[PDB]
Scaffold this active site. Structure first.
Site, PDB file in Angstrom:
ATOM      1  N   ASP A 137     -14.098  -7.007 -47.112  1.00 21.98           N
ATOM      2  CA  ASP A 137     -12.881  -7.761 -46.782  1.00 21.98           C
ATOM      3  C   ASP A 137     -12.862  -9.184 -47.354  1.00 21.98           C
ATOM      4  OD1 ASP A 137     -12.759  -5.396 -45.224  1.00 21.98           O
ATOM      5  OD2 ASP A 137     -11.644  -6.389 -43.618  1.00 21.98           O
ATOM      6  N   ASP A 159     -12.859  -2.585 -49.183  1.00 21.02           N
ATOM      7  CA  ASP A 159     -11.535  -3.189 -48.967  1.00 21.02           C
ATOM      8  C   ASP A 159     -11.501  -4.686 -49.266  1.00 21.02           C
ATOM      9  OD1 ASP A 159     -10.958  -0.567 -47.745  1.00 21.02           O
ATOM     10  OD2 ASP A 159     -11.841  -1.401 -45.916  1.00 21.02           O
TER      11      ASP A 159
END
Length: 320
Positions: A137, A159
């Site tokens: 992230d 991600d």
């Protein structure tokens, strides 16, 4: 000046431009930009570093969990913020944490660590030659955020470019980090939660999708449809109106890309539901490199469709 925050805090309370130079060195410091028109110019993109260690599982001095949104090293929440020639990084050692035993009391479940969070008010976010270091992230954008990344670098695995807002990448380097923990897949480049009402999300123009020395082939997805768990009027579940958009144009891709992948979310009854890339706004256009393919699962933009992703069209009211 002592620190980046001391400079930002001393700036006049008006909406006038404010330039903060940063001489080379490591600035272990967190930021929350509330002032508009703040420009951060560093001496060298690699030499100048802003970096704090914050994981979602970690506790604030309060102390409850930081969370993904609380883990940001630099949190931009103001219009016209620009960053030039510097690294923003999250010092969290993801690999070492995964190396920890399950019996280890210090190992964390919530392993996401945001380097840069571009909040809802982070409009006209401009990024000339900037490195973003992270693992999980790394870059987080929210609806309302409109940003432009040129000649920039972003690293991570799981991600690491994720969120709702419009974030465009022009001739940028998107690095996929190596992992010693698992067998492939190693991670996913994007996880867009672009709202159904907003037409643009995560766009990549003329950029490179590179991998780290240890990364195997077919170990990374281009994208994975993020449907954030949202507390609505009738309950808390994966927001259906969050059909993310990640688009890659004239982008060279190393062999680690296998294509797109699906995301697990939570039902209205609170059970594992799957959101599939077919139903998601995932597109390619004349992408090159060994990791580029065309098949039933690599939907590709038409010549007419590509016209919509011209830089003036995507940012009409912005000079860029």
């Amino acid at each position: 000046f002592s620190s980046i925050n001391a400079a930002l805090k001393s700036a006049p309370k008006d909406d006038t431009p404010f330039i903060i130079f940063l001489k080379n060195g490591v600035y272990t410091e967190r930021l929350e930009v509330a002032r508009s028109h703040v420009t951060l110019k560093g001496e060298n993109r690699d030499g100048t570093v802003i970096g704090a260690n914050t994981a979602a599982g970690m506790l604030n001095p309060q102390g409850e969990k930081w969370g993904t949104s609380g883990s940001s090293t630099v949190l931009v929440n103001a219009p016209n913020f620009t960053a030039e020639n510097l690294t923003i990084r999250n010092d969290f050692d993801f690999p070492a944490n995964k190396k920890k035993a399950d019996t280890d009391p210090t190992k964390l479940k919530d392993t996401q660590a945001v380097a840069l969070l571009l909040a809802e008010n982070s409009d006209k976010a401009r990024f000339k030659a900037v490195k973003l270091e992270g693992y999980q992230d790394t870059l987080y954008s929210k609806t309302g955020s409109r940003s432009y990344f040129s000649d920039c670098e972003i690293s991570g695995h799981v991600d690491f470019i994720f969120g709702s807002g419009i974030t465009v990448f022009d001739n940028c380097n998107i690095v996929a980090r190596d992992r010693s923990d698992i067998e492939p897949p190693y991670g996913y480049i994007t996880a867009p939660s672009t709202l159904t009402t907003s037409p643009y999300g995560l766009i990549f123009i003329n950029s490179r999708l590179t991998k780290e020395p240890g990364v195997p082939a077919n170990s990374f997805a281009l994208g994975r449809p993020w449907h954030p768990t949202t507390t609505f009027a009738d309950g808390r579940y994966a927001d259906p109106a969050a059909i993310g958009q990640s688009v890659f144009i004239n982008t060279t891709m190393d062999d680690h890309i296998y294509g797109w992948d699906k995301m697990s979310g939570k039902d209205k009854q609170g059970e594992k539901i799957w959101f599939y890339p077919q139903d998601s706004r995932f597109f390619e256009a004349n992408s090159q490199g060994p990791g580029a393919a065309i098949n039933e699962g690599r939907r590709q933009l038409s010549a007419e469709q590509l016209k919509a992703f011209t830089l003036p069209m995507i940012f009409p009211d912005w000079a860029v």
